[PDB]
Amino acid sequence: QFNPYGDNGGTILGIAGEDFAVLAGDTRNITDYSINSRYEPKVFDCGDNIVMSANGFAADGDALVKRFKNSVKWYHFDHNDKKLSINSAARNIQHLLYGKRFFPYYVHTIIAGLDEDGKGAVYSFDPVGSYEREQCRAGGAAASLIMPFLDNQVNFKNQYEPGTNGKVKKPLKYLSVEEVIKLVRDSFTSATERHIQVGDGLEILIVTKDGVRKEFYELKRD
Amino acid sequence: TTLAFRFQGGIIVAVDSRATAGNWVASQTVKKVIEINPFLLGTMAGGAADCQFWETWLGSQCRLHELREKERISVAAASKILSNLVYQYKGAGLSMGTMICGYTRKEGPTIYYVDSDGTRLKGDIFCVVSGQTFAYGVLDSNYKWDLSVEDALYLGKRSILAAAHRDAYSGGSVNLYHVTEDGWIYHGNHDVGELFWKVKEEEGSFNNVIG
């Protein structure tokens, strides 16, 4: 029979800072054991300081990102050029995803930006539009490799204050953009080693009050 | 694990916060209680998306009822809006196990269990443990009507802990709500990791563990 779905692999990672947010993804596109592209961008500027990535089936991911970009355009038209807040974007994307509830978009969606208080925000969606706001989220093939690392290194999980013997947890702290980028690079370097679908390149989009800037780092090509 | 029970002091609503994709723990920070309106709560079990979407939609339908009728919607009416909606989608593969909990002057404290199968039941206590829904608590021994609000909160909290420990797909933190006349009150989020050790030491229970 004809199968309407495919797997294009890749991995996306969203980390929220105090006054910034990052959305990173590998630039590798694959089909089975074949590499389709070593540089196919997966993380997009959608306007109004919102970055979006739909990872899984590339065709569904491209379609969803288009519909949301279109959704932002018509928000401006119908609401006197009002800036679309990240919470409003998140709710809109849920309705996009749930629209195809009985023919789902086979994608893991993460969006990053600043909230209305100017604090960094990351939202994570399932294929059928269930969403939740988080500090940390990894999506895609190597999500299972990266998320435990982020739990340990971003939220300081299973880490206690030395000399307490597990009596006092390590204090939660906001990471600097420079510290967050190191974790993103180390996460993807580690994921590239142990996952066949992850590698080639890493593109990071950093969101601040000043706007959206882009950093690119090479990954192993095997 | 979602728990809603009725007592003299009103309704206690206790849920866990774990979301799973197979054996993968996707999140430990999921809000499984939905605040439909200041007097109405909805628990969520089954498909995360199905519960979130339709219980959010219910809040819209409940809001329109107040604007049109200039009165707060009854729990019976609100529950039946959701139950009549899911019944239209019956056999389409919606996965939903929810309790609609509120207080109104007309009915008093009311819990309605609404199912993706189109089952709508009124009861004093409803529990959803693993994939099974029960008209009894996870423990049920401690349950007496005349019970202190802060005592009743503990039973709900303790009951989620009992399930969270044994069930692989229950865990994260316990979210507590108290529903009364003139609205519901949030009683905070309690991490099961910290809660377990504290409860063990204080209660002298979970002896089969060791620590």
Binding site: - | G46, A49, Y169
Partner: peptide, 5 residues
């Protein structure tokens, strides 16, 4: 995949 207490 989708999330599912």
């Amino acid at each position: 995949x989708f999330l599912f207490x």
